[PDB]
């Protein structure tokens, strides 16, 4: 609540949030993207909140 980071690291190679793709972790909502295209799409933001 007093913290929403954005850049824990500037460069990640271990990016596979399957937590969303298979919902292996929990419920979610994706905006503007498929939940499954996690290794097909890339962004320069790797962390938040």
């Amino acid at each position: 609540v007093y913290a929403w980071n954005r850049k824990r690291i500037s460069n990640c190679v271990a990016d596979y949030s399957v937590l969303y793709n298979s919902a292996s972790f929990s419920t979610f909502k994706c905006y503007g993207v498929s939940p499954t295209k996690l290794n097909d799409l890339c962004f320069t933001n790797v962390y938040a909140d």
Binding site: R6, S10, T44
Partner: protein, 40 residues
């Protein structure tokens, strides 16, 4: 992110000329930068 661009050139006030600066760095920072000082 934070950006810095620069250009090397001889300078003959700040005489005019036509050019564009090229990036040096692109660094995500998240800093509410509002003021600065230069260093000698």
């Amino acid at each position: 992110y934070f950006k810095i661009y620069s250009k090397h050139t001889p300078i003959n006030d700040l005489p005019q000329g036509f050019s564009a600066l090229e990036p040096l760095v692109d660094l995500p920072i998240g800093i509410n930068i509002t003021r600065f000082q230069t260093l000698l």
